[PDB]
From a paper:
The κ-opioid receptor (KOR) has emerged as an attractive drug target for pain management without addiction, and biased signaling through particular pathways of KOR may be key to maintaining this benefit while minimizing side-effect liabilities. G protein-coupled receptors (GPCRs) are membrane proteins that can bind to numerous ligands and transmit signals into cells. In response to binding of extracellular ligands, GPCRs activate intracellular signal transducers, such as G proteins, arrestins, and/or GPCR kinases. Biased selective agonists for KOR that trigger receptor activity toward the G-protein pathways rather than arrestin have been the subject of interest for their analgesic effect and as a safer alternative to opioids with reduced undesirable effects.
Numbering used by the authors:
A (entry chain D): 4 to 38, 43 to 102, 110 to 123
B (entry chain A): 55 to 89, 91 to 203, 206 to 257, 262 to 301, 305 to 347
C (entry chain E): 1002 to 1019, 1025 to 1040, 1058 to 1081, 1085 to 1108
Write the structure that this text describes.
């Protein structure tokens, strides 16, 4: 239904910030993140073992999913102006991402 | 009927290439196609490591049929170095993938640092340095002793003054190379899937059966690959022909199989790799 | 002598299958021209060949010859290991 994208906010260059979209209503499982046209940052499997990294800057970001708490994280590290954009978690159908979060914009400069 | 020497050298011949081709091909796919994600560092180094163990198959196969070691001392030392060293490196890298997948599920925000390339690379350098100790021991301690008529190459140990140091280092290796690695990997998986069932649609029931499926294979591989040899070569150190020396070399190959079967399990079953390799070879 | 000395036995067995002492003397002497089962597998046959020599001195030696081929086959099966 409604996905509460946490994290976000401004930061200094070369810094870090962990973003955490969650659906505590357990209606949808946030399994991927999405960032010109729509950008597609890394996603992860449901049970959170294997992540499919984002090629653009795979030397800067890591993601993890708390399966038990139905939460998806991602903490960018040492990013640049290239990474500055709006960020929204993408959920999945309970049983082609079906539900898309409102999104937050990380603003670095 | 010299079929038994024929069957076994075949197994050493079948296993040699599948491990050598795959591990070479898996490495050369990684180094060119996908230069990196943490999983990529693990598969590559495991492949690179457990490629070099399959390098030791000719020398070990020679002694079987030939029933002696025609390659001398210095070539026995380095082969004893290579085979020991990259057995530990492959088992440890195979085990370190084990805790990596466990850490993601059970300590998810702790995975945020564990899954970084540097963390993998840092963990993936230490793991060779740990094995290096075994590599260094096998060089000096490795030599060739005449059996009687027959030269033999093994880890050379003083046999004076009730010295059982061979049985000790075979005890020492068996627990460093098999037991505590098995218990790590058998724990991290069996505990990772408990969090999965704990999560509380049928995405759980389908995926649980799917990951239980996948989990059982690796431990089934690792158990059946190394359990019969480790049991065998310990008993040969406390006590105890022609047919027995063949059963023993069959069991050696089974240990060699784990290094040839690994790329199939840890690369060809990984879609983040299997998707890439497909293009290079299905253009 | 390789298998040729062996052929002395099995050929002389067929001749014995038809004073048969000449074949047996040529057979028992050929045996002496032949790892524990191997040296034992020839000593048993000489004894059974020796058993048949007496039965020739007095026809009824065919039974010992029958018990002699199966012995020869026993060291054939042992020789099959190589
Ligand atoms: C008695 N024995 C030797 O005497 C050494 C013989 C060699 C090796 C190269 O050339 C001669 C053993 C034979 C088997 C084996 O090789 C085998 C697994 C293992 C586990 C515990 C040991 O304690 C131990 C071994 C060795 C080295 C490592 N391998 C692993 C490859 C994948 C299968 C070696 O030691």
């Amino acid at each position: 239904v409604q996905l509460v994208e946490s994290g976000g906010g401004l930061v200094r260059p070369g810094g870090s910030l962990r973003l955490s979209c969650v659906d505590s209503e357990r209606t949808s499982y946030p399994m991927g993140w999405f960032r010109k046209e729509r950008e597609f940052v890394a996603s992860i499997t449901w049970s959170g073992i294997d992540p499919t990294y984002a090629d653009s800057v795979a030397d800067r970001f890591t993601t993890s999913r708390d399966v038990a708490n139905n939460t998806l994280y991602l903490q960018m590290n040492s990013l640049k102006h290239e990474d500055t954009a709006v960020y929204y978690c993408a959920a999945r159908a309970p049983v082609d991402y079906d539900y898309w979060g409102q999104g937050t914009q990380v603003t670095v400069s | 009927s010299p079929a038994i020497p024929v069957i076994i050298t075949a197994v050493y011949s079948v296993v040699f290439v599948v491990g050598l081709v795959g591990n070479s091909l898996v490495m050369f796919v990684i180094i060119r196609y996908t230069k990196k994600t943490a999983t990529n560092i693990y598969i590559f180094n495991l492949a690179l490591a457990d490629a070099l163990v399959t390098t030791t198959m000719p020398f070990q196969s020679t002694v079987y049929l030939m029933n002696s070691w025609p390659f001398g001392d210095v070539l026995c030392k380095i082969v004893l170095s290579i085979d020991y060293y990259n057995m530990f490196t492959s088992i440890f890298t195979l085990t370190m993938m084990s805790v990596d997948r466990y850490i993601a599920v059970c300590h998810p925000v702790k995975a945020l640092d564990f899954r970084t390339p540097l963390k993998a690379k840092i963990i993936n350098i230490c793991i060779w340095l740990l094995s290096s100790s075994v590599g260094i021991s096998a060089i000096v301690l490795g030599g060739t002793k005449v059996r009687e008529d027959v030269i033999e190459c093994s880890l050379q140990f003083p046999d004076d003054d009730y010295s059982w140091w061979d049985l000790f280092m075979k005890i020492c290796v068996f627990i460093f190379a098999f037991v505590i690695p098995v218990l790590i990997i058998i724990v991290c998986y069996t505990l990772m899937i408990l969090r999965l069932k704990s999560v509380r649609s049928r995405e759980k029931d389908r995926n649980l059966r799917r990951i239980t499926r996948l989990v059982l294979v690796v431990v089934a591989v690792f158990v059946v690959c190394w359990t019969p040899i480790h049991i065998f070569i310990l008993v040969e150190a406390l006590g105890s022909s022609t047919a027995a020396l063949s059963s023993y070399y069959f069991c050696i190959a089974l240990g060699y199989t784990n290094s040839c079967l690994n790329p199939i399990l840890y690369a060809f079953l990984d879609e983040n790799f299997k998707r890439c390799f497909r293009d290079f070879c299905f253009p | 002598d390789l298998e040729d000395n062996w052929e002395t036995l099995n050929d002389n067995l067929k001749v014995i299958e038809k004073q048969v002492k000449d074949a047996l003397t040529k057979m028992r002497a050929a045996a002496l021209d032949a790892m524990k089962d191997f040296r034992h597998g020839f000593d048993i046959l000489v004894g059974q060949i020796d058993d048949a020599l007496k039965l020739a001195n007095e026809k009824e030696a065919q039974a010992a010859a029958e018990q002699l081929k199966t012995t020869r086959n026993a060291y054939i099966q042992k020789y099959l290991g190589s």
